[PDB]
Known about the structure:
1 chains, 215 residues, mainly alpha, 67% helix, membrane protein, calmodulin, HEAT repeat protein, Protein unc-80 homolog
Amino acid sequence: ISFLPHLRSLINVCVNLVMPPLPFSTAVVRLVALQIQALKEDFPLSHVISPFTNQERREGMLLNLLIPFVLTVGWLEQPEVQLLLQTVINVLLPPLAESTSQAAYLALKVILVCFERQLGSQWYWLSLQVKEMALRKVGGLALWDFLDFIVRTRIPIFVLLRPFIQCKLLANHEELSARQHIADQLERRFIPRPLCKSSLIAEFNSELKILKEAV
């Protein structure tokens, strides 16, 4: 059925209609995901994400168009994953607002944790693109949240960031309020890992909802 063109239009207006409660947003994103899966060459994911890159309402787009797609689909191909990753990370490091930066950080975390099987081909690459945010301190407080979450779960990114997170990051205001927390959690203490991505998805959905009422 997917190849028939008349269906494509129905999706477009539908996603346009999105910017609805959770039961409708989940269904729309599910339909988009199935459409991407069915047709890859003719309808790559790039088309539906390209027009909303401009800083007009991209915060809401990232909040309720990208996070649901990744959450509900977390067989996608490598190049589309690369395009999605570079698009999301562009916001943090332009080649700016606090809320859109937080949304982009959330997208970065979800992408990092879900696609651990295929993304790990370029861990070093990401470990190179992840220094600058801490170097120039983009984002008010979400940066510390990201770093402390990484330290807590300490996924393969933690493999490369251990030297940069101790020597060049340790050496008085609200920024340091939680600094002791992350520093303590960076110590070689007992490490209770999450059982599976399903457990983390609960907190992911909770924080997604909270950010939704935040807007």
